[PDB]
């Protein structure tokens, strides 16, 4: 069982983890520096359009932590990105790595719906294995 968290995302809103109890969470941790995570995140973006009733997806970006840009910098930075559909929480404190078990990116989590971490996977991930994973949960 996972600790709740509140962070804002670049959108402005802000997303609490316990808002997700009852659904599958997948997690994305990623850093703009990381062209693996940049080549893979219109994967991201349409497993999130896709989402529907079945899960629901999120990304985390953590400023100045594992050599990330500050806040500031990363929102003016992404608006050269075009995501329609993905969600950017942004955590400053570097906490969520730490919770995780982050140790490089990407790093996909998957979360059930009773809100245990099920699984982390260092690394890349194809779109329809992240899929499957989703399924597997309960």
């Given amino acids: 069982e996972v ?3 509140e962070l804002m995302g670049v959108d402005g ?5 316990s808002d997700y109890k009852g659904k599958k969470v997948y997690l994305k941790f990623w850093a ?16 999130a359009k896709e989402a529907g ?14 050599g990330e840009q500050s806040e500031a910098d ?3 930075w992404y608006k050269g990105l075009d995501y329609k559909n993905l969600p ?3 955590d400053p404190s570097g906490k ?16 059930d719906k009773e809100g245990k971490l099920v699984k982390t ?11 499957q994973t989703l399924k597997e949960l309960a």
């Avoid at 809103?13 to 983890?17: A, I, N, S, V, W």
């Avoid at 009733?53 to 970006?61: P, W």
């Avoid at 969520?96 to 979360?111: C, D, K, N």
Wanted: charged share 20%; proline share 6%.
């Fill in 3 to 5: 600790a709740d968290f």
């Fill in 53 to 66: 009733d079945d899960y629901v997806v999120l990304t985390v970006v953590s400023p100045g932590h594992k």
């Fill in 96 to 111: 969520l790595l730490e919770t995780y078990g982050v140790r490089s990116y990407p790093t996909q989590a998957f979360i």
């Fill in 74 to 76: 990363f929102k003016n």
């Fill in 13 to 17: 809103k802000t997303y609490r983890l």
């Fill in 32 to 47: 703009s520096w990381c062209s693996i995570c940049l080549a893979s995140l219109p994967d991201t973006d349409e497993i």
């Fill in 88 to 90: 950017v929480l942004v």
């Fill in 121 to 131: 996977h260092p690394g890349f991930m194809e779109k329809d294995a992240i899929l």
